Design a protein around this ligand. Structure first.
Ligand SMILES: Nc1ncnc2c1ncn2[C@@H]1O[C@H](COP(=O)(O)OP(=O)(O)O)[C@@H](O)[C@H]1O
Ligand SMILES: [Mg+2]
Length: 337
């Protein structure tokens, strides 16, 4: 047969119908969740008469109206379809996006589980807008939202007898070097031991109690950081006896369009890490180690470990080549599940 094609086709088909009952399902463990989010064209983009070339006709489908010239100059479209677990159009808010990406994973930490949620995509696409908050608005972004609901889940009966402390970290990863955003960008050192386990020495874990505390911390970190070229990782830890119960690492990745002049070849580092991250993620469905995947190594290797990739799309015509690139990385992540 042509079975590889048949398999790829099936995988497409299956994803193309899904209810929101599939990721949020009990008793099936959707370990890997891949999403896409089209942001609207902004006024500068409108001002430059940019054509919106992206459509999101269903919850599980996204279309690229790839503009093309035939050899004889004749204009046409190659309308390309991609399907994801969720696809959010230019109307979907952060709270809506949060509801189907990260929120499901909150419970995983209170179940003694590890969680990761990545914002992936080109620069100016909305990674920080989604994760940090409206570009700022710490409270209108996933970091905060996840936290809001971490506190809510502790006050429920089922999870009150755990005697939990809520800790919080926040750091930047830039050219192989970690920097604590809660400790004045202090350059930290990353140690692997014999067991191949990682420690980020001197990474400050602030205890928190209310959501507003966390909003304060997120704003300190974001402030004490000054765009792309660097990863940002905000973590939420639940400790019981100062022993770690569960961990949610929320990451605002770097610009994915730097496959690379001379010596601004941080784009080498950025590339290695994104390639790394991809491989790591696909190991959570069963190399070239980067500082990012090293620091997050526990959050993939685990038994109850879950993840969520949110691919950000810039809808402009001028961005199409970058958009198509973003979508292939995303396709290639879903590929194993
Ligand atoms: N879904 C959206 N709705 C409205 N504005 C958005 C949206 N996504 C991004 N933006 C705006 O676009 C700009 C670029 O977003 P940003 O998240 O900083 O890009 P990047 O993810 O590359 O860092 C910001 O001003 C942000 O407020
Ligand atoms: Mg941003």
């Amino acid at each position: 047969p042509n079975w590889e094609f048949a398999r790829m086709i099936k995988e497409f088909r299956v994803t193309m119908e899904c209810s929101p009952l599939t990721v949020t399902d009990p008793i099936e463990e959707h370990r890997i969740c891949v999403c896409v989010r089209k942001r609207p064209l902004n006024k500068q983009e409108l001002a430059k008469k940019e054509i919106d070339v992206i459509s999101v006709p269903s919850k599980c489908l996204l279309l690229v109206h790839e503009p093309k010239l035939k050899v004889d100059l004749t204009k046409y479209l190659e309308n390309q379809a991609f399907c994801f677990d969720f696809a959010f159009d230019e109307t979907a808010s952060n709270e809506v996006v949060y509801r189907f990406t990260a929120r499901p994973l909150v419970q995983t930490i209170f179940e003694g589980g590890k969680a990761t949620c990545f914002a992936y995509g080109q620069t100016g696409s909305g990674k920080t807008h989604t994760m940090g908050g409206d570009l700022q608005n710490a409270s209108k972004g996933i970091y905060a939202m996840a936290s809001r609901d971490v506190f809510l889940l502790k006050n429920q009966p089922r999870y009150r007898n755990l005697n939990l402390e809520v800790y919080v970290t926040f750091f930047e990863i830039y050219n192989g070097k970690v920097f604590d955003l809660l400790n004045k960008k202090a350059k930290l050192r990353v140690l692997e031991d014999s067991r191949q386990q990682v420690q980020v020495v001197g990474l400050q874990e602030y205890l928190v109690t209310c959501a507003d505390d966390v909003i304060k911390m997120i704003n300190m970190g974001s402030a004490c950081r000054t765009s792309s070229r660097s990863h940002a990782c905000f973590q939420i830890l639940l400790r019981t006896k100062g022993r770690l119960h569960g961990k949610f690492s929320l990451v605002d990745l770097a610009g994915n369009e730097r496959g690379a002049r001379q010596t601004r070849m941080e784009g080498a580092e950025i590339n290695k890490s994104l390639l790394a991250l991809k491989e790591c993620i696909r190991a959570l469905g069963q190399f070239r180690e980067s500082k990012l995947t090293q620091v997050l190594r526990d959050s993939f290797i685990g038994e109850n470990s879950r993840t969520c990739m949110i691919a950000m799309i810039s809808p402009g015509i001028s961005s199409c080549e970058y958009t198509l690139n973003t979508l292939r990385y995303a396709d290639r992540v879903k590929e194993l599940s």
